[PDB]
């Protein structure tokens with residue numbers, strides 16, 4: 125007996141197109157999404173060129189419309205040069221992404237004043253998400269308060285960070301957050317197996333105490349999101365390993381395993397992969413869209429999942445229970461048992477749907 | 487310039503059919519809903535007969551399917567006799583309603599042990615809501631913890647109650663709550679004008695300090711819901727005034743006025759009248775459904791709104807800014823400028839839609 129889930133939403137994926145298409149492209153990354161039970165993705169702007177301007181957004185929109193197999197929204201990225209310039213296109217994006225720690229010269233911000241300027245100029249009704257680790261979480265929360273608006277913290281990975289966010293929520297501050305599966309299911313204990321290259325990720329893997337703190341504070345976590353960050357094995361194992369793990373194909377099986385073990389409920393999962401992504405990002409419903417999962421099937425994660433061009437996974441060897449059997453997207457069979465059945469270009473930009481605009485005062 | 491809102495959801499209405507149709511019926515109450523920008527309602531079970539059994543639910547379902555003009559779900563009511571008997575029909579209801587303070591002999595529970603029995607027997611994945619005032623909020627929260635599940639607190643009306651709920655959320659407990667407009671926009675200061683009969687409501691009107699505490703703790707409030715509780719003027723002004731206010735037609739204009747004053751944001755409103763109702767009750771999206779409001783139009787609430795059969799309102803004389811201009815429900819014009827344009831029976835039971843079942847493990 126299968127369980128029918130709604131179309132799940134991953135608000136944090138790196139699909140690498142334009143400019144990194146040996147790692148992933150819209151077609152391969154959205155195949156990976158569908159195979160993971162994900163019907164809508166929000167794609168990050170650290171591509172080449174980075175999505176930091178209207179022309180780059182226009183290019184990425186067309187590449188996504190032509191290549192995506194599931195529905196999507198595209199983030200804009202904050203730069204040291206673009207505050208006050210994005211107003212015309214801001215509503216067409218998933219939101220604005222701030223990279224507040226290590227990143228590419230183009231998304232690097234030199235000063236908290238630049239964070240301020242983005243919070244002051246980006247339309248106040250539209251989402252802002254931040255890569256903000258350790259004290260940076262507190263710093264960006266201060267900027268959000270000074271500018272009297274909300275912020276969403278990406279991939280919370282540490283006891284320190286979840287407890288800070290917990291304290292902020294207890295004070296009534298408008299902050300939400302997400303957690304990625306590697307920070308719930310991997311830790312320092314796995315670095316020996318992974319090695320120092322494969323194990324490179326930002327935020328880094330936490331201690332067992334970090335992992336246990338995230339589980340104990342599940343009530344504080346608004347969303348799960350993969351931070352699908354594909355790189356090839358050659359890159360991960362080479363001289364200057366880039367940080368990041370592929371994760372679209374493994375996120376739901378890992379979480380279903382936890383549900384079957386009673387570590388969280390089905391509802392907890394659906395708040396975090398459906399309802400809360402919708403409401404934080406004002407993402408529209410997908411008509412006639414659902415995911416059928418088999419909760420009894422036990423399997424072991426292999427050395428690579430079928431669809432991501434990363435062609436490796438840090439979860440290799442973990443035993444999971446639960447698997448995606450079928451995905452229907454807007455009335456068409458999109459995935460069955462290891463085969464994607466919608467072509468590149470089937471997916472659509474949800475921000476162009478009438479129901480997909482973020483409401484605002486006139 | 488109008489603002490387009492999604493279809494708003496009121497999770498707490500009393501539509502009085504069967505058995506109280508001089509006060510309201512499905513057709514009149516759902517006309518009131520549409521005129522208030524509400525496209526989906528959850529109807530309470532304290533009708534005559536009360537919806538405390540499968541035969542009464544079946545009757546109410548058919549009456550609603552024939553009379554409702556907007557979409558709906560129907561609550562079941564907990565009684566002193568029905569714990570352990572509702573399993574077959576539970577998934578067809580909005581949820582289970584517990585009346586834990588003053589009510590009708592038929593929904594009255596005599597002992598906290600009966601609350602326990604309901605929490606133990608009602609399917610654990612399905613919603614439970616409680617009318618629980620003052621210490622009863624703490625009591626029902628204890629029962630929810632003992633039985634390891636969530637609870638939703640109806641119409642929070644007091645500083646005491648919102649602070650208790652705040653403390654419970656700070657401890658990570660699975661509790662949500664709603665607030666009704668009369669507890670945000672009326673207080674003891676209005677009892678002289680209303681008089682003791684019209685002013686009768688449960689929970690009672692609070693002090694100015696209660697009202698200010700609810701506003702200050704807006705972050706703790708998950709939903710707004712009207713507790714639309716129509717009674718005729720003859721009843722409200724007579725010897726034994728029943729408690730309750732009509733509220734469907736005034737809720738959104740009152741809240742839009744507060745938005746225009748900067749007391750909360752448009753997003754805050756849409757979380758509380760759309761996204762959070764959806765996610766707490768697992769209510770499905772409504773396709774091709776939206777509400778257009780005019781935020782500039784200033785008017786004064788009259789002595790009665792056009793649609794509710796209550797034919798009175800406690801908000802008479804309040805100045806508001808914002809009004810519903812048009813509602814489209816599932817592709818049909820349902821309301822324009824004072825005229826409802828869908829007939830009785832247009833509305834549907836959302837729990838019968840494929841997307842409207844609450845997900846559960848097999």
Ligand SMILES: O=C1C[C@@H](C(=O)O)NC(=O)N1
Nearest residue numbers: 138325326327353367368
């Ligand atoms: O911040 C980031 C971005 C990401 C990528 O490779 O794009 N991978 C990571 O591990 N951290």
Ligand SMILES: O=C1C[C@@H](C(=O)O)NC(=O)N1
Nearest residue numbers: 500687688689715729730
């Ligand atoms: O608990 C309730 C129920 C309601 C009604 O009249 O049905 N009206 C109220 O004021 N309190």
Ligand SMILES: [Zn+2]
Nearest residue numbers: 255278279326
């Ligand atoms: Zn990041």
Ligand SMILES: [Zn+2]
Nearest residue numbers: 136253278279
């Ligand atoms: Zn993120």
Ligand SMILES: [Zn+2]
Nearest residue numbers: 136138168351
């Ligand atoms: Zn990322």
Ligand SMILES: [Zn+2]
Nearest residue numbers: 403406407756
């Ligand atoms: Zn929204």
Ligand SMILES: [Zn+2]
Nearest residue numbers: 617640641688
């Ligand atoms: Zn009540």
Ligand SMILES: [Zn+2]
Nearest residue numbers: 498615640641
């Ligand atoms: Zn209620």
Ligand SMILES: [Zn+2]
Nearest residue numbers: 498500530713
């Ligand atoms: Zn009520």
Ligand SMILES: [Zn+2]
Nearest residue numbers: 394765768769
């Ligand atoms: Zn749901």
